[PDB]
Write a protein that binds this ligand. Structure first.
Ligand SMILES: [Mg+2]
Ligand SMILES: [Mg+2]
Ligand SMILES: [Mg+2]
Ligand SMILES: [Mg+2]
Ligand SMILES: [Mg+2]
Ligand SMILES: [Mg+2]
Ligand SMILES: [Mg+2]
Ligand SMILES: [Mg+2]
Ligand SMILES: [Mg+2]
Ligand SMILES: [Mg+2]
Ligand SMILES: [Mg+2]
Ligand SMILES: [Mg+2]
Ligand SMILES: [Mg+2]
Ligand SMILES: [Mg+2]
Ligand SMILES: [Mg+2]
Ligand SMILES: [Mg+2]
Ligand SMILES: [Mg+2]
Ligand SMILES: [Mg+2]
Ligand SMILES: [Mg+2]
Ligand SMILES: [Mg+2]
Ligand SMILES: [Mg+2]
Ligand SMILES: [Mg+2]
Ligand SMILES: [Mg+2]
Ligand SMILES: [Mg+2]
Ligand SMILES: [Mg+2]
Ligand SMILES: [Mg+2]
Ligand SMILES: [Mg+2]
Ligand SMILES: [Mg+2]
Ligand SMILES: [Mg+2]
Ligand SMILES: [Mg+2]
Ligand SMILES: [Mg+2]
Ligand SMILES: [Mg+2]
Ligand SMILES: [Mg+2]
Ligand SMILES: [Mg+2]
Ligand SMILES: [Mg+2]
Ligand SMILES: [Mg+2]
Ligand SMILES: [Mg+2]
Ligand SMILES: [Mg+2]
Ligand SMILES: [Mg+2]
Ligand SMILES: [Mg+2]
Ligand SMILES: [Mg+2]
Ligand SMILES: [Mg+2]
Ligand SMILES: [Mg+2]
Ligand SMILES: [Mg+2]
Ligand SMILES: [Mg+2]
Ligand SMILES: [Mg+2]
Ligand SMILES: [Mg+2]
Ligand SMILES: [Mg+2]
Ligand SMILES: [Mg+2]
Ligand SMILES: [Mg+2]
Ligand SMILES: [Mg+2]
Ligand SMILES: [Mg+2]
Ligand SMILES: [Mg+2]
Ligand SMILES: [Mg+2]
Ligand SMILES: [Mg+2]
Ligand SMILES: [Mg+2]
Ligand SMILES: [Mg+2]
Ligand SMILES: [Mg+2]
Ligand SMILES: [Mg+2]
Ligand SMILES: [Mg+2]
Ligand SMILES: [Mg+2]
Ligand SMILES: [Mg+2]
Ligand SMILES: [Mg+2]
Ligand SMILES: [Mg+2]
Ligand SMILES: [Mg+2]
Lengths: 122, 46, 210, 159, 393
RNA sequence: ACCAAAGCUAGCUCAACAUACUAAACAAAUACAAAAAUACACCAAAAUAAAAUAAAACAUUCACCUAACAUUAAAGUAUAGGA
RNA sequence: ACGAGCUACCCAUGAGCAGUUUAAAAGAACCAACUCAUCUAUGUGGCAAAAUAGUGAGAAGACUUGUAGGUAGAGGUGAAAA
RNA sequence: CUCGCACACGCUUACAUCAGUAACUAAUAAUAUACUGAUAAUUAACAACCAAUAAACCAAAACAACACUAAAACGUUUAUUAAUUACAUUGUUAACCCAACACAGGAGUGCACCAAGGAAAGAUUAAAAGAAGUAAAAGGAACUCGGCAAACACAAACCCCGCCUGUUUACCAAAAACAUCACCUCUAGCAUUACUAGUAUUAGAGGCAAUGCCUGCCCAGUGACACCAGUUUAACGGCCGCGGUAUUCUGACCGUGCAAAGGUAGCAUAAUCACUUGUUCUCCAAAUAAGGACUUGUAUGAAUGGCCACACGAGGGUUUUACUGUCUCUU
RNA sequence: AACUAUUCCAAAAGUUAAUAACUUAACAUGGACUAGCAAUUUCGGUUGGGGUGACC
């Protein structure tokens, strides 16, 4: 009576049953019944130049660690936006209506990589 | 003639009769799945 | 299973049969028209033989009359006349224009409804009388039908007259037609059996009296 | 739904019996909505209309447990909201007729925050409350800007 | 009447709207906020969907009147697979020619001359028949779509082998699957033949006129046969989109301007897929007239007039066993009138090139009664085919 | 002398108190034939509980029988029952 | 509640029937593949919760058979053997 | 000695290499495709996934020339728009699956009868009884319920019952049972899911069984139509006593009574209560068998059909030769 | 009893003359009637073993 505990896999079924193993599709089916692959769906790998870059995958044993402070939204605000806001308020040029000069963005859909929809994979 | 071989295996028939989708198209099959979950089954369906 | 003893027949395609005898192509010219019969073929769906009828820009499969042959001329009309018409075997005319002793087939029930009655092979009804702008016909079951006189009917008897005298040679021919054998259960006859002599049921009328 | 005895004797057969009301398709005119609704009704409903002296009077006078219809609750909610808002869309060309219609039902006038909840079920009320309380989350930038402005105002007022 | 739809098989009507929507001045509460179905809430009414940026594949199909070439006058178009009922009668009517039973005397004189035959004619043609019907395929019983272009191309090779004795066959070339359009007016209705052909032979030089002026003058008083209950339109395709421009498949300055022979192939297994012979003749009449009209309007201009120089186009229709031959002479452009000069068309009908073929040897009572190969042979069909190929030279 | 035997633990059972009640894990895929990113829709529903038993049979009847209202008494009382 | 992956009957979609006799692809005839199981002998906790060997009937049809779907127990299905 | 190779379905690493087997798996060893551990593996061109919207289309596949009936699966071109741009994903092993088993069972398709697959005997001895095979003097069914089985035969006839091909109690009954052409009754004048995309020469509910001769009488009861009269048996069903008479035996005949009519044609000791092994002829040396006759069968009998008939039957009984270890009588 | 076919009455829609009479397209409610399809239950005891006969 078959195997219930075994995972349902394309290796198990007939020629009709063809299931992917988790890869991402890169195209569609074209005019002649062939597969037309879209270059836009291909993940273009982004690599830097590592020849003129000096760092190593292992850390010196005598190099000390640090007190673990996780990055906080309050700390990021106090480090990035707070000097500009404080300088503009002490100079009298602070504008509560427009905050685009301090790094704030009202709507995400203008820019290329959104945050809440998570437009970028990695 | 000779008996013992009433089970002729077919994955199409198996997944169409006892499949997850076939269980969830009917409220009685849904209640079957809830009974298997209440019993704590490792495999709820095929 | 709702109807017993049906199944296991030969593969049959269905022919689209046009039942409305008077069907103009366009509404610009609603006059009577004349068409040409090309061929007469066998149809597996019914006992009758059908005919391909072409006129204008279209063809229709119609139910053929007894002597309709290849390359014939058939007139369809709605015009009622007080000199009536001289009825041929192909023509479609309203029942008000036909003579009294006319044999008819493909009788239309309601004006514009289409032909429903007298469709089987060799069966023909007969016009009886026309009173007060109303036609009365006699069906193949010998029952009188009262109909409006403007209903179109085709004059003649349906083709393949010897379908009643067709002999079936074996049970294999029944299984070819698709009739499964009857059940083997022995049922004792009730009171329904016997030779029932009943008087003829009254005239069935589709003319709505206001 | 119930049980019955054949020939009204106790010692006879016990029978499951259903009794169904007689139904009719009648059109009803509501003066508040100025609409004709084709409603399947009962002779008891028509008797209650005639006893309560109006279709609108019947809907606005008979409570929830007597009406027992979601359509009746929706009709009551609609006309009670109409009476609460005092909308000009009843008769845009006839203000005298509009005042004459709203004069007769002034006994059932209830304010706006009460009039739009009388015909709602629990699921509709939960969806309505979720829609009214549906807010996008405020970004932490706005909170931090307000906190920094408060801190800067406190430092400016302390010198 | 009897409508041909079925209530179950048709798409269902939408469910009747909730009674909340019938209340004026009342906002319905729906499950659109939770973006999934919920029992007890009203069904929301959504506006028709508007994809602001358009997609080619996934959009709805544009209407036919949206197309720029859409016109109110319905033109009747003839393509490759259109069938005509009274095929010769409809072809003669819509083409305005006269039907002649034999091939011309020039063609018969070219065929019957013994100097124009190949070395071993019967041997090569019987070997070509056997090659098409049995030899060319791995299977024992080749299908008709296999053996019909094989026998056509083999006959073209056989008549092409004559180029060493007659060095004027090098002025020709073959063409495939071209776009042909020829539009004209014939008695207050607009006709157009448009589509493709199987294989089309063209040449540098035009073909000489074949009918005498006595035949042209006797064609003038010929009355066209008429048929009442069928309109001559029947069998064509009604189209509301078209272009009124005569389009041959070849552009300007082509070195091989004049088509000399059309070839029509019936490559199908089943009997209802292949054309009837009358339909096949009708197809060659109207396609050959389309090519001839393309010629006679490209070389002369859009004005409708009689032709002082006739245009002769030939065609061969092939079933694979039974051939039809056409020579069509075009003389007249102004087909609006029915009283003027009619064109001419010579049709040899149902020329049987062989009776039957036996792919496997039939055995009756343990002996071979009939051997392998074709039964019955008529070389006059090949002689007519060779004359039709050699008509230029 | 083989086969054997002996442990005291894993853990359960009944309550009480008690917040107030579908635990843990959710990075991805999950109701295509579940664990398969990706296309013009349809979606949804209710109608009394019955019988085995007891009445030594069995037909009217037969406590509890998946509808919160508790304890001390009235009280196994008035009533309802092929009484 | 669950069951028509065996079987009973249907709807689709396919695939097989070589040789021989006959004007015949005729529910004709001989006999294979193939489908049933007439008779006998073994077997009877057996090869087998129905088989093996010999012998048999049909074998171009009312024939077998692959895949898939449908009819569910107060029922389905049945060329009635309950 | 010959069930081979591959594919579809199904199984899920059981496949391959190396090493081990004291014990676990093979119903036993040897070792290993069936156990143990480690390491690797099946690479797409084959197969799956792989456009709709309108329109011209009556014309079978059977070597298809052209035909028959049971009316027949399998696609073109014309127009509209179909992202245009190398390499996508998935199955690639096996000695395998369903049968509790490494089971003499079941298992679809394409080409072959070997060029591929395998081994009936673990080693002795050769008792009885048992299974399978070969051969047999003389006789040739004398054995037995039956010529069951076997045999150098593999033929010719008479009946019974069903016309026939077919179907059925899977796992004790394949038939005389059911179905079947043909012949009869009833019930229906009609439109969008059966019947049916049909229309009384049609479609359902049934009965009996081709064909040939036929199907006699009865509505008194019970049903069914008519909603009371009245009509129906090819509806459920029924179709006589008592007594005397012609030269005996018998009763052509008569008297009287009851009923709705009193069983007609045919056939017959039958598959037909009992008497019964009814009486007679043939067959045999002998027959309660079989066939042909007589026939009140006081309980046969006419579509719950009666008689005969060709062809037919793994049906049930009979005879002739031929054949034989069935048997005399076994070896 | 449910369901499926009838029939009647009530309900409902209405029409008549200056209260009484008459009709019902498709649904459709209540009370009755005729039948099919059916629902629940049972097979008194003694018997020179039961059944038949006989008896209580
Ligand atoms: Mg299991
Ligand atoms: Mg698979
Ligand atoms: Mg596979
Ligand atoms: Mg590619
Ligand atoms: Mg089992
Ligand atoms: Mg039919
Ligand atoms: Mg017919
Ligand atoms: Mg019958
Ligand atoms: Mg019967
Ligand atoms: Mg009891
Ligand atoms: Mg009891
Ligand atoms: Mg109870
Ligand atoms: Mg009392
Ligand atoms: Mg199924
Ligand atoms: Mg099945
Ligand atoms: Mg054969
Ligand atoms: Mg045969
Ligand atoms: Mg035979
Ligand atoms: Mg069987
Ligand atoms: Mg066997
Ligand atoms: Mg033997
Ligand atoms: Mg045989
Ligand atoms: Mg049943
Ligand atoms: Mg029986
Ligand atoms: Mg029985
Ligand atoms: Mg396994
Ligand atoms: Mg071992
Ligand atoms: Mg392999
Ligand atoms: Mg041994
Ligand atoms: Mg021995
Ligand atoms: Mg022996
Ligand atoms: Mg021997
Ligand atoms: Mg001897
Ligand atoms: Mg004897
Ligand atoms: Mg024998
Ligand atoms: Mg013998
Ligand atoms: Mg013999
Ligand atoms: Mg028989
Ligand atoms: Mg038989
Ligand atoms: Mg059967
Ligand atoms: Mg059996
Ligand atoms: Mg048999
Ligand atoms: Mg048997
Ligand atoms: Mg019988
Ligand atoms: Mg007769
Ligand atoms: Mg008879
Ligand atoms: Mg009789
Ligand atoms: Mg009577
Ligand atoms: Mg009577
Ligand atoms: Mg006699
Ligand atoms: Mg007897
Ligand atoms: Mg009798
Ligand atoms: Mg009878
Ligand atoms: Mg009898
Ligand atoms: Mg016969
Ligand atoms: Mg038999
Ligand atoms: Mg016999
Ligand atoms: Mg001896
Ligand atoms: Mg009870
Ligand atoms: Mg009972
Ligand atoms: Mg008793
Ligand atoms: Mg007793
Ligand atoms: Mg006794
Ligand atoms: Mg005793
Ligand atoms: Mg007694």
């Amino acid at each position: 009576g078959a195997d219930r505990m075994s995972k349902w896999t394309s290796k198990r079924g007939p020629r009709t049953f063809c299931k992917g193993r988790g890869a991402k599709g890169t195209g569609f089916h074209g005019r002649d019944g062939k597969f037309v692959q879209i270059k836009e769906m291909i993940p273009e790998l982004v690599v830097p130049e590592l020849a003129g870059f000096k760092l190593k995958p292992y850390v010196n044993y005598r190099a000390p660690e640090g007190t673990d402070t996780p990055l906080t939204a309050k700390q990021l605000f106090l480090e990035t936006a707070a000097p500009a806001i404080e300088k503009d308020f002490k100079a009298g040029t602070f504008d509560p209506e427009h905050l685009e000069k301090y790094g704030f963005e009202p709507t995400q859909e203008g820019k290329l990589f959104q945050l809440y929809p998570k437009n970028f994979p990695r | 003639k000779a008996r013992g071989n009433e089970y002729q295996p077919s994955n199409i028939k198996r997944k169409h009769k006892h499949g997850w989708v076939r269980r969830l198209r009917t409220p009685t099959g849904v209640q079957v799945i809830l009974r298997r979950m209440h019993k704590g089954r490792k495999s709820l369906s095929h | 299973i709702q109807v017993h003893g049906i199944g296991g027949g030969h593969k049959q395609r269905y022919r689209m049969i046009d039942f409305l005898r008077f069907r103009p192509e366009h509404e610009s010219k609603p006059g009577p028209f004349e068409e040409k019969v090309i061929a007469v073929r066998y149809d597996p769906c019914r006992s009758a033989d059908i005919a391909l009828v072409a006129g204008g820009n279209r063809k229709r499969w119609i139910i053929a009359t007894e002597n309709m042959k290849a390359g014939d001329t058939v007139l369809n009309s709605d015009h009622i006349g007080r000199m009536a018409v001289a009825a041929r075997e192909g023509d479609a005319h309203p029942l008000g224009a036909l003579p009294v002793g006319t044999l008819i087939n493909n009788v239309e029930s309601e004006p514009g409804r289409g032909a429903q009655y007298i469709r089987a092979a060799g069966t023909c009804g007969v016009l009886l009388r026309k009173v007060n702008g109303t036609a009365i016909i006699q069906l193949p079951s010998k029952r009188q039908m009262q109909v409006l006189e403007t209903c179109i009917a085709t004059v003649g008897r349906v083709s393949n007259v010897d379908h009643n005298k067709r002999v079936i040679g074996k049970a294999g021919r029944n299984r070819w037609l698709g009739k499964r054998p009857n059940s083997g259960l022995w049922q004792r006859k009730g009171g329904w059996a016997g030779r029932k002599i009943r008087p003829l049921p009254p005239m069935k009328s589709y003319v709505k009296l206001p | 739904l119930g049980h019955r005895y054949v020939n009204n004797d106790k010692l006879s057969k016990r029978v499951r019996k259903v009794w169904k009301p007689q139904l009719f398709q009648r059109e009803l005119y509501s003066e508040i909505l100025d609409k004709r609704f084709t409603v399947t009704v009962t002779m008891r409903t028509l008797d209650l209309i005639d006893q309560a002296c109006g279709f609108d009077f019947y809907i606005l006078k008979t409570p929830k447990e007597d009406l027992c219809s979601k359509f009746g609750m929706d009709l009551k909610r609609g006309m009670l909201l109409r009476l609460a808002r005092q909308d000009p869309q009843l008769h845009p060309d006839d203000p005298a007729r509009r005042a004459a219609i709203y004069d007769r039902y002034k006994a059932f006038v209830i304010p706006e925050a009460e009039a739009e909840w009388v015909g709602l079920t629990l699921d509709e009320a939960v969806e309505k409350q979720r829609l009214l309380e549906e807010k996008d989350p405020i970004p932490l930038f706005k909170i931090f800007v307000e906190e920094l402005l408060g801190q800067l105002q406190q430092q400016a007022l302390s010198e | 009447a009897y409508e041909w739809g079925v209530r179950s098989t048709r798409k269902p009507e939408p469910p009747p709207l909730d009674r909340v929507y019938e209340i004026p001045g009342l906002e319905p509460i729906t499950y659109a906020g939770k973006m999934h179905f919920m029992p007890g809430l009203a069904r929301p009414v959504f506006p028709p969907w508007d994809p602001g940026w358009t997609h080619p594949k996934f959009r709805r199909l544009p209407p036919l009147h949206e197309h720029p070439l859409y016109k109110d006058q319905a033109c009747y178009v003839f393509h490759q697979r259109c069938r005509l009922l009274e095929g010769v009668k409809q072809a003669l009517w819509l083409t305005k020619t006269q039907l002649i039973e034999g091939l011309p005397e020039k063609v018969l004189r070219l065929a019957d001359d013994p100097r124009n035959h190949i070395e071993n004619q019967d041997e090569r043609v019987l070997n070509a028949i056997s090659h098409a019907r049995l030899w060319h395929s791995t299977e024992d019983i080749p299908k008709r779509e296999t053996y019909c272009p094989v026998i056509v191309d083999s006959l073209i090779q056989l008549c092409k082998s004559q180029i060493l004795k007659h060095p004027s066959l090098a002025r020709r070339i073959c063409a495939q699957n071209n776009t042909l359009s020829a539009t004209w007016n014939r008695e207050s209705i607009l006709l157009q033949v448009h589509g493709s052909s199987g294989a089309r032979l063209n040449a540098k030089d035009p073909l000489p006129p074949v009918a005498s002026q006595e035949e042209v003058e006797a064609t003038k008083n010929h009355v066209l046969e008429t048929f009442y209950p069928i309109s001559p339109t029947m069998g064509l395709q009604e189209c509301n989109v078209y272009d009124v421009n005569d389009d041959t498949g070849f552009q300007e300055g082509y070195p091989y301007p004049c088509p000399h022979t059309l070839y029509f192939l019936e490559s199908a297994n089943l009997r209802p897929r292949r054309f009837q012979p009358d339909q096949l003749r009708a197809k060659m009449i109207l396609f050959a007239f389309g090519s001839a009209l393309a010629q006679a309007r490209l070389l002369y201009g859009n004005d409708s007039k009689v032709l002082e120089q006739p245009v002769v186009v030939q065609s061969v229709g092939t079933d694979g066993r039974l051939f039809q031959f056409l020579v069509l002479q075009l003389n007249t452009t102004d087909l609006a009138s029915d009283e003027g000069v009619k064109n001419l068309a010579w049709v040899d009908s149902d020329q049987l090139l062989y009776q039957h073929f036996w792919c496997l040897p039939v055995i009756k009572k343990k002996v071979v009664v009939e051997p392998v190969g074709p039964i019955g042979f008529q070389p006059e069909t090949f002689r007519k085919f060779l004359a039709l190929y050699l008509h230029g030279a």
